[PDB]
Amino acid sequence: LDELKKEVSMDDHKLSLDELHNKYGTDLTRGLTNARAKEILARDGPNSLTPPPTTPEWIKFCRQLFGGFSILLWIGAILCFLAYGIQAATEDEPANDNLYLGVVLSTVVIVTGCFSYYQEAKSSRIMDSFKNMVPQQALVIRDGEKSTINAEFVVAGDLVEVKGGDRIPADLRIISAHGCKVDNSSLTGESEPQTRSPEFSSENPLETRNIAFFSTNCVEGTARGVVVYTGDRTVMGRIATLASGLEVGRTPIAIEIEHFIHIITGVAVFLGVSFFILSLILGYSWLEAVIFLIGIIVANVPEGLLATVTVCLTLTAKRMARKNCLVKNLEAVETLGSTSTICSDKTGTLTQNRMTVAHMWFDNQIHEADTTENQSGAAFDKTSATWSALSRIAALCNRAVFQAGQDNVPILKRSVAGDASESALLKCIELCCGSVQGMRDRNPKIVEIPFNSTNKYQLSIHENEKSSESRYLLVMKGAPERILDRCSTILLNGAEEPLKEDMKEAFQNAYLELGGLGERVLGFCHFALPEDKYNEGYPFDADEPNFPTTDLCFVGLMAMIDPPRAAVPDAVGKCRSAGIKVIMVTGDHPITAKAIAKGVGIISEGNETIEDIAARLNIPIGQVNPRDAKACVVHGSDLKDLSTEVLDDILHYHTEIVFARTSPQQKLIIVEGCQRQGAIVAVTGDGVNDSPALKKADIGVAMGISGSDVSKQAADMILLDDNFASIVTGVEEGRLIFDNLKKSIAYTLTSNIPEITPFLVFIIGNVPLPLGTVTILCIDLGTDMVPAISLAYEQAESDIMKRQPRNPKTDKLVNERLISMAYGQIGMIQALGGFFSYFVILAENGFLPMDLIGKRVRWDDRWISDVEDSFGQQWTYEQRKIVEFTCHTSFFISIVVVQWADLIICKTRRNSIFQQGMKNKILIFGLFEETALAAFLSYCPGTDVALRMYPLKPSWWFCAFPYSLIIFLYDEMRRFIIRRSPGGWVEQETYY
Amino acid sequence: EGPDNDERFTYDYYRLRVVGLIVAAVLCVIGIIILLAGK
Amino acid sequence: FLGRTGSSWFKIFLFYLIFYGCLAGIFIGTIQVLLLTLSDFEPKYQDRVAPPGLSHAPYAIKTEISFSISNPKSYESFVKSMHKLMDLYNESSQAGNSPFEDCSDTPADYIKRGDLDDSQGQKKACRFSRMWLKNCGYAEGKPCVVAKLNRIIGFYPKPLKNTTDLPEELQANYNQYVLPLRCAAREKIGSIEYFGLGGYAGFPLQYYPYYGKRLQKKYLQPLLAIQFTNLTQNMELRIECKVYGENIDYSEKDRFRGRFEVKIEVKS
Numbered sequence A: 001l002d003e004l005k006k007e008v009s010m011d012d013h014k015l016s017l018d019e020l021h022n023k024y025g026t027d028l029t030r031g032l033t034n035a036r037a038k039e040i041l042a043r044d045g046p047n048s049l050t051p052p053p054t055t056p057e058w059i060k061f062c063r064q065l066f067g068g069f070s071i072l073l074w075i076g077a078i079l080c081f082l083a084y085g086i087q088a089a090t091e092d093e094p095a096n097d098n099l100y101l102g103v104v105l106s107t108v109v110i111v112t113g114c115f116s117y118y119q120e121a122k123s124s125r126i127m128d129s130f131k132n133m134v135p136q137q138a139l140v141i142r143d144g145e146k147s148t149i150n151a152e153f154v155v156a157g158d159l160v161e162v163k164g165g166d167r168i169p170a171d172l173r174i175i176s177a178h179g180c181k182v183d184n185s186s187l188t189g190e191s192e193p194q195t196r197s198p199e200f201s202s203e204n205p206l207e208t209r210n211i212a213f214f215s216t217n218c219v220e221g222t223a224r225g226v227v228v229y230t231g232d233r234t235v236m237g238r239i240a241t242l243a244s245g246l247e248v249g250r251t252p253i254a255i256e257i258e259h260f261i262h263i264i265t266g267v268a269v270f271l272g273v274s275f276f277i278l279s280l281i282l283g284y285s286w287l288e289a290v291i292f293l294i295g296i297i298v299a300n301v302p303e304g305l306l307a308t309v310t311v312c313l314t315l316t317a318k319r320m321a322r323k324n325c326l327v328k329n330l331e332a333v334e335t336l337g338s339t340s341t342i343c344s345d346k347t348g349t350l351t352q353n354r355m356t357v358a359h360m361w362f363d364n365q366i367h368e369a370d371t372t373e374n375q376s377g378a379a380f381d382k383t384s385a386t387w388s389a390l391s392r393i394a395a396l397c398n399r400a401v402f403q404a405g406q407d408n409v410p411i412l413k414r415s416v417a418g419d420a421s422e423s424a425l426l427k428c429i430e431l432c433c434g435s436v437q438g439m440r441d442r443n444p445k446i447v448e449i450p451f452n453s454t455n456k457y458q459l460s461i462h463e464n465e466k467s468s469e470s471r472y473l474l475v476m477k478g479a480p481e482r483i484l485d486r487c488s489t490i491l492l493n494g495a496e497e498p499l500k501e502d503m504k505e506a507f508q509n510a511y512l513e514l515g516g517l518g519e520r521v522l523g524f525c526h527f528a529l530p531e532d533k534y535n536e537g538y539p540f541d542a543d544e545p546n547f548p549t550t551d552l553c554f555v556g557l558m559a560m561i562d563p564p565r566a567a568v569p570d571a572v573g574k575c576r577s578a579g580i581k582v583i584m585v586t587g588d589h590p591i592t593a594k595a596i597a598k599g600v601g602i603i604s605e606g607n608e609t610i611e612d613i614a615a616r617l618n619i620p621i622g623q624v625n626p627r628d629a630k631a632c633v634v635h636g637s638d639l640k641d642l643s644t645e646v647l648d649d650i651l652h653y654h655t656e657i658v659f660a661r662t663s664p665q666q667k668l669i670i671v672e673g674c675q676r677q678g679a680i681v682a683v684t685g686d687g688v689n690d691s692p693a694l695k696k697a698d699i700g701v702a703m704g705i706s707g708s709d710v711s712k713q714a715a716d717m718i719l720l721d722d723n724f725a726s727i728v729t730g731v732e733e734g735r736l737i738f739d740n741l742k743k744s745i746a747y748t749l750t751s752n753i754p755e756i757t758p759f760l761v762f763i764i765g766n767v768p769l770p771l772g773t774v775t776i777l778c779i780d781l782g783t784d785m786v787p788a789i790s791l792a793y794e795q796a797e798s799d800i801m802k803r804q805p806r807n808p809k810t811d812k813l814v815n816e817r818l819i820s821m822a823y824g825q826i827g828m829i830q831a832l833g834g835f836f837s838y839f840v841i842l843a844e845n846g847f848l849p850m851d852l853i854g855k856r857v858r859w860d861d862r863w864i865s866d867v868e869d870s871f872g873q874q875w876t877y878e879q880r881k882i883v884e885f886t887c888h889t890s891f892f893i894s895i896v897v898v899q900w901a902d903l904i905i906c907k908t909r910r911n912s913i914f915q916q917g918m919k920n921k922i923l924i925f926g927l928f929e930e931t932a933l934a935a936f937l938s939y940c941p942g943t944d945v946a947l948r949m950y951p952l953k954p955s956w957w958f959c960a961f962p963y964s965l966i967i968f969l970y971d972e973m974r975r976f977i978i979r980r981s982p983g984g985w986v987e988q989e990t991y992y
Numbered sequence B: 001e002g003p004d005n006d007e008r009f010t011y012d013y014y015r016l017r018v019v020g021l022i023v024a025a026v027l028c029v030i031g032i033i034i035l036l037a038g039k
Numbered sequence C: 001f002l003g004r005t006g007s008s009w010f011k012i013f014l015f016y017l018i019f020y021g022c023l024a025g026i027f028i029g030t031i032q033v034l035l036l037t038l039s040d041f042e043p044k045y046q047d048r049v050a051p052p053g054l055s056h057a058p059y060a061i062k063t064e065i066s067f068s069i070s071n072p073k074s075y076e077s078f079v080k081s082m083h084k085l086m087d088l089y090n091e092s093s094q095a096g097n098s099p100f101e102d103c104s105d106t107p108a109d110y111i112k113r114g115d116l117d118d119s120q121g122q123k124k125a126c127r128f129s130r131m132w133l134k135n136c137g138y139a140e141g142k143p144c145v146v147a148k149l150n151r152i153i154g155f156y157p158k159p160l161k162n163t164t165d166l167p168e169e170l171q172a173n174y175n176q177y178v179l180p181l182r183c184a185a186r187e188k189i190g191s192i193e194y195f196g197l198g199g200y201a202g203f204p205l206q207y208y209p210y211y212g213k214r215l216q217k218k219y220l221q222p223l224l225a226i227q228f229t230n231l232t233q234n235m236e237l238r239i240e241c242k243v244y245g246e247n248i249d250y251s252e253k254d255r256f257r258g259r260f261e262v263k264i265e266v267k268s
């Protein structure tokens, strides 16, 4: 469906103005007829974007109500009402058991539904942001007259007019223009104004001057044009549809959840029906056969687990909110940890998005300035008298000014009225020479010649601030070579000197080096005009050369670039040390893209492209073995004629990849290419041209300050302070939460065994029921909750940023090793500790373990109010039941006591508690509150009716203590083996 | 005692409940103290 | 295979065999020590049987015994359980001076055979003739229910003293030696008739205290036969038999705590 939109567009900028009118039945001068425009409206439809059909929240909520655990809990809830129905008909049961348990279980499903619904959130308003880029109104020429109309009423063929400050209402063929410049950052991510004129200037319509696009704005001048595309058919309207239309897809974390749901659901249905038939064979009435099944359901399903996961995710997202990293989708909290490839935009993401002075060439020396936002570098020069001469030209031969009321904000961050290069120079001098306004007050400008297309230079004449002179100084800047052809002397370390071929060659060298760094280079020179030849009232003519512009003194060079953000180089290296592959994907030109790649460490030192090898060896590129080149730089124009299989080979064959001059669909294609190889991919960006890629990414991260509204709609995560170091933190947090989820899951599952085994022995042994159904829910929904959550606050056991990204095909959240430990080893020890306390309670009340076998028949018989114990005493029905429920209560408390040790062992997968310590305060809180809850549930009056919880005698609490301790020792010995031999036996069997 | 051994079939479940609830409360307070050591 | 290789499948079996073996051996060990802390003659706790339960022979479907006099197999169900109990009180079962003893044919005081020790043989229990149960196949019309006080080791059932007012106000009040049992329904549409030891409507105190199964096997607890020769027919009659005493109490939950709940209906 969207495969059409993933392709490069076709256009009609090649046609003549006249020819273009024939195609759209239009007038170049009079414009369309009121009737013809209305006709075309009904024909083509409105100049608007329609949002894609969404899934209502209704269906979204209910889709969770049927996912493995909820299905089993539904079967339980209904099976409760089943047994209740069968009762209400047969023998009038005045009880509330099956009825209430059926109500409780149905509530558990609904509430669990809210948790998973909260986790599976999708806040997407892509198409809405795009719609915000179409103006409310447009100016059209109809019947030879200009009028404002609803922009939706704009059709292909009419004559539109735009001017500085307004949004392009539709894709236009420029037919007339006067000084028109446009901001195409929507399509390129670059905000430098692009001229628009009627002349065709490139085969590529996205590069030609005679096309203006919807989603962009006119920055200055005026233009008229013929509408060629409207609504969904515009270049960026299609990007809108592509972006808004892209299928979301399941996250890595989501896939893991479903996976263990299958496992646990599997064992549940297995043991469920495996013992349902095992009971009927033993001659159990279907009346009972279902009651046992309900218990089996409740025992096997970890009722509180899915909600635990959600809370652990939420708490991890809260910590990241506190580092200026907003998470829109709870699952995106983990994806960053599983990320193996980052596709990053350059401008406004890796870079500050601001022309900044990078180097200066004066005194036959290359000086480097500090490009960082917060200025974390050092000085270059202050002493040289040459510097002050260059500094003066940079301030004086400059027409840029700071906007009013910025004195509060830092120099480099403040808004400037002017072109990017003049702003850069302004901020450079203001920083290291103080107020520039002061320099422009001490040296009043009397005449100037602003930068001309033809002159290729800008000159200014000022009253020298010096009192002993107060004469006229000439300054000029422009193209380095043009400035050179106008110089005779060079200000070396203070004093001038003739411009010999020697210094002239050093100039060329300096010029070539700076240009090689992808930096824009300017020349600077001045000339102190002779006093006798220029009186204090001498008039200077700016129109006609009234003053010399030759034999001037060359002062120096200055170079500039849109520099990396301070934290970016280090963040890139850190991603790469964690084994994450970092690719650059930018709409910017290749020379600039490549230079920043080396600056931030995308391309490491020494690595070459095929073009680099060819130039170094002075040989044809076809003569170069492409396998000798680990780095590559792909232009979008070449990308366009490559198949995906060939794109896949590029991705496979290079470690250091730069995709430059890419369109928005091309970014999507590169992302998909990476994913196709089985990689989890993150995208980082800030422009509307990142929207499709951000949507398709497993996780999209947008910049918060510099980011466009669209990009932040398309993302899963926002960096609110533009701190790229947050990606590094995000991946670290993502890995940590993945491990801690394992700990929390194992902990929760472990207590399933002591809830399952009592029901089994109840059938096979014919003893009184050791633990009840209600009692199970008091564990999974009550006591285990805070402890399970607390594992989310566990510190790393080792340097997680030192390991490679997990293999999502092999490294699962819940594997066989977890089940073996939780179900086969620790849970089994917990089961016994439960049974022990059960036998203790009964034996101390007169029913010794031996006489318990095959007694349930008489025990449950409501009409036998005289059962004989081991000592020959006789018990009524309600009397023995009180002891039985007291058994449920102590078995319950036994679970809590054995979960103490389990909580401590689940703390660490490898390390010892004596190494990791007990610095998790939430965990300790869990221990205290868990025990408080259990005690309250046993001793609070009335709980014997609502939950069948009975007061325990002090000695009862200590039954499971020896089992709780064996768990601690056992797991500590086991992990001691793991560490002592990384070999594999204990490791490959039990290492979560 | 002999025929007056009524205490043999008696248990102070009332005190046990009072003590049990005291303990539960104090464990609840202790927990808050440790948690609130930083919020 | 599914998971691993044969070598791995073996090792995982050798482990869980030794592992579960140890766990079973430990579990058994903790059961040993538990038993080691317990007496053979007396349970550690008795507060959960404390107030004695009162149970009868007619096995009630739901605290009810409804049947038809004009039908044979209508009551043959209740006669099965009635027979089961009384079959134990046979004279052929009580033979010789061992381990039985002839006790007062009239309600007497308690009998202490020492302590709950094995320092003596089987503590000798009082004989009880089912022949003390006058009038009661059993009552084919108007049932002859048999009551019973639940056995509790070392329990001395103490009758109420005639200090103040009483339900069966002072009638045949053998204050010193009889634990009374008065059945009731207002709703007085019946005819209560009690049979027992010495002809009294109670339990003779000479059968106490019970020394337990280990120290007193073949022991016989006193019975109290109750006959309802009601002149009514074809209606549910809620009859409650209540025992009175210092050590006797009741509960709204446990409807068998020192009392009966019988729903007789001679629907004939």
Ligand SMILES: *[C@@H]1O[C@H](CO)[C@@H](O[C@@H]2O[C@H](CO)[C@@H](O)[C@H](O)[C@H]2NC(C)=O)[C@H](O)[C@H]1NC(C)=O
Pocket: C086, C087, C088, C090, C092
């Ligand atoms: C306990 O006493 C009952 C009294 O009914 C015995 O029942 C006797 O059963 C036999 C054989 O079935 C009959 O011939 C008699 O008529 C019954 N009564 C009597 C008085 O002998 C019953 O057998 C006795 N049980 C034991 C174990 O001795």
Ligand SMILES: CC(C)CCC[C@@H](C)[C@H]1CC[C@H]2[C@@H]3CC=C4C[C@@H](O)CC[C@]4(C)[C@H]3CC[C@]12C
Pocket: A757, A760, A816, A817, A819, A820, A823, A824, C003, C012, C016
């Ligand atoms: C109540 C009692 C009788 C039930 C005992 C169940 C035992 C036999 C179960 C419980 C947990 C189970 C193990 C759980 C995990 C694994 C790892 C997997 O890669 C192979 C199977 C294996 C090794 C299972 C084998 C059987 C097992 C040990």
Ligand SMILES: *[C@@H]1O[C@H](CO)[C@@H](O)[C@H](O)[C@H]1NC(C)=O
Pocket: C134, C135, C229
């Ligand atoms: C009980 O049986 C006796 C004979 O043993 C008889 O005289 C008497 O009438 C019976 N009593 C009743 C109330 O039927």
Ligand SMILES: [K+]
Pocket: A694, A695, A696, A697, A698, A699, A700, A714, A715, A716
């Ligand atoms: K995404």
Ligand SMILES: [Mg+2]
Pocket: A189, A345, A346, A347, A348, A349, A685, A686, A687
């Ligand atoms: Mg950008």
Ligand SMILES: [Tl+]
Pocket: A298, A299, A300, A301, A302, A303, A752, A755, A776, A780
């Ligand atoms: Tl469970």
Ligand SMILES: [Tl+]
Pocket: A302, A748, A749, A750, A751, A752, A780, A784
């Ligand atoms: Tl659990």
